[PDB]
Design a binder for this molecule. Structure first.
Ligand code: NA
Ligand code: NA
Length: 327
DNA sequence: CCGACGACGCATCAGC
DNA sequence: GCTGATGCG
DNA sequence: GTCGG
């Protein structure tokens, strides 16, 4: 549905969501508003009243009332007020820095630190993650065109294979589903020597190599199984440099790899459905394993999984291409 | 009425 | 110093 | 804030 249909309503609900998360620290209200915004955004009719919207799942009495106020007046008094509230709008803004969450944003604003300029003047008050989030503030808010994601994938797969040709690497997320753009890069990594029953350095050796070839530029966090950092494609001598991009790399045991690839490929709606179907078939699926459920509901040992298809076969579902996992 | 609403890796804090 | 809690994503 | 046991 065109954004002109209910974009006013959905924009209002998304703004209310952000204030719940970042200012009121009410995460379940943030998700309530997002859920409302999503079901309205997919509604293929320009809404005429709150009662109409309340028929939708996730829209209740309070949001119906707000929609009535918005349709009648073109705005929402409470949103107008918080928008111009210097403290609340500054707290909400600062959480756009990666590493600054609601608690840090509140603490900063409490001591007069309200803008990117104020953060730049107060480096010693920022931790390592927050300094990187500030350094790449604008780059991190840009989307990644699919052509750049392919070039990024070219580098990851080549360097991974270079370290050890027995590594297996898969770039998941919307990109694997075919998306024309991405917000970041999610790489899932495994190695036949790493199973749930049985090296460190498996992840470090890959991160190191990507740093040696100057693809990974910064690290946000790094442990034995999860890396979160920054990468950047090489710029042709003489062309504008590519923005810096967020990349995550996860090391997963081989016997849990394809469960992980399935989960992190998504979509979220699709996983909810598959997990719903799996239950009504006698199986429980999480990001790690698929396990059978006994007649009293006791989950048994995880079942062998050697491919994505294996998971579909267990639950009597035809294999769906990532391209067809929108829901 | 009133609890669920995602679990978890990593960085860093709070407490001992 | 070690252990658990909290923040963040 | 919404849903539902
Ligand atoms: Na409803
Ligand atoms: Na943030």
């Amino acid at each position: 549905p065109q954004e002109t249909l209910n974009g006013g309503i959905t924009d209002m609900l998304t703004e209310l969501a952000n204030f719940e998360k970042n200012v009121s620290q009410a995460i379940h209200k943030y998700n309530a508003y997002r859920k409302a915004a999503s079901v309205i955004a997919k509604y293929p009719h320009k809404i005429k009243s709150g009662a109409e919207a309340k028929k939708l799942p996730g829209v209740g009495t309070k949001i119906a009332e707000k929609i009535d106020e918005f349709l009648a007046t073109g705005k929402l008094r409470k949103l107008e007020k918080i928008r111009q509230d210097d403290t609340s709008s500054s707290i909400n803004f600062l959480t756009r820095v990666s590493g600054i969450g609601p608690s840090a944003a509140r603490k900063f604003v409490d001591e007069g630190i309200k803008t990117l300029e104020d953060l730049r003047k107060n480096e010693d008050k920022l931790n390592h993650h927050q300094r990187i989030g500030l350094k790449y503030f604008g780059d991190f808010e840009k989307r990644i065109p699919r052509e750049e994601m392919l070039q990024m994938q070219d580098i990851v797969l080549n360097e991974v294979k270079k370290v050890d040709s027995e590594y297996i690497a898969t770039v998941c997320g919307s990109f694997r589903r075919g998306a024309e753009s991405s917000g970041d890069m999610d790489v899932l990594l495994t190695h036949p020597s790493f199973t749930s029953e049985s090296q460190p350095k498996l992840l470090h050796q890959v991160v190191e190599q990507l740093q040696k070839v100057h693809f990974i530029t910064d690290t946000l966090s790094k442990g034995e199984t999860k890396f979160m950092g920054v990468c950047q494609l090489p710029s042709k001598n003489d062309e504008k440099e590519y923005p810096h991009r967020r990349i995550d790399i996860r090391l997963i045991p081989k016997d849990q790899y394809y469960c992980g690839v399935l989960y992190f490929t998504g979509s979220d709606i699709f996983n909810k459905n598959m997990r719903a179907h799996a239950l009504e078939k006698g199986f429980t699926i999480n990001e790690y394993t698929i396990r059978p459920l006994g007649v009293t509901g006791v989950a048994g040992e995880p079942l062998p999984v050697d491919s994505e298809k294996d998971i579909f076969d267990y639950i009597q579902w035809k294999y769906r291409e990532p391209k067809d996992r929108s829901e």
